[PDB]
């Protein structure tokens, strides 16, 4: 894991078969593999997977990502969903639900929060999400509060089980959390005082980037709610 800047020489040799992840770009003209994002370049061992971890707040739809959207419009056969403000809209088909039929259409209305997975994310087409499992927790997120978070904090919260945020929050209250890889984290508790205390802790922990400070922040926020 080394730090890399855009335009720098790519360390990996063409003789090794590599699957390219985020941050690495393959020139359509020169066929050279070069970085376009600034961050830490991670390379696997043995089939080698290489990518760059870079900081960003604007989400870009990619397949097999868990995202939270909001219904902003109802069309003929799909829903117009927004995964982030000012970003391009996303399509959610009516048939993209469990036990879907041409006789029963989904009951979602404009303004409802939906937790879904990205299925088709063509760069030249409207992205699409689905509320049914690709291999067979999705659906409407009733009430609660949504939290704005940078994409690196959201990826670390969903995939790294050593991330202490979920542990220090369970140690204070019983809470339901839905983690979206587009920077939206949904939280709901039994009482409004607990949901707000989870909002304030996630907001402050997102700003520090220091993992070793999550426990002290949670202790003072729930103390202020009391």
């Amino acid at each position: 894991s080394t730090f890399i800047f855009p335009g720098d020489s790519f360390p990996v040799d063409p003789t090794t078969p590599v699957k390219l992840g985020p941050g690495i770009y393959c020139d359509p003209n020169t066929q050279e593999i070069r970085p376009v994002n600034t961050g830490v370049l991670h390379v696997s061992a043995k089939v080698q997977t290489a990518y760059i971890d870079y900081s960003s707040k604007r989400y870009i739809p990619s397949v097999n990502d868990f995202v939270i959207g909001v219904i902003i419009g109802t069309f003929s056969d799909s829903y117009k969903v927004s995964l982030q403000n000012f970003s391009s809209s996303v399509s959610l088909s009516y048939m993209a639900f469990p036990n879907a039929s041409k006789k029963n259409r989904p009951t979602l209305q404009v303004g409802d929060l939906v937790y879904a997975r990205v299925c088709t994310a063509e760069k030249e087409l409207e992205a699409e999400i689905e509320c049914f499992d690709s291999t067979t927790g999705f659906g409407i997120l009733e009430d609660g509060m949504i939290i704005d978070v940078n994409l690196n904090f959201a990826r670390q919260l969903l995939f790294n089980n050593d991330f202490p945020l979920l542990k220090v929050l369970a140690a204070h209250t019983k809470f339901e959390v839905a983690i979206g890889l587009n920077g939206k984290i949904w939280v709901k508790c039994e009482e409004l005082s607990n949901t707000l205390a989870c909002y304030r802790t996630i907001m402050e922990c997102c700003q520090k980037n220091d993992t070793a400070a999550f426990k002290d922040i949670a202790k003072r926020q729930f103390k202020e709610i009391l």
């Binding site: 927790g137 969903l158 929050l169 809470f175 339901e176």
Partner: peptide
């Protein structure tokens, strides 16, 4: 098999 929506503090 990574979980996304889960209730904590059971």
């Amino acid at each position: 098999v990574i979980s996304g929506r889960k209730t904590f503090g059971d």
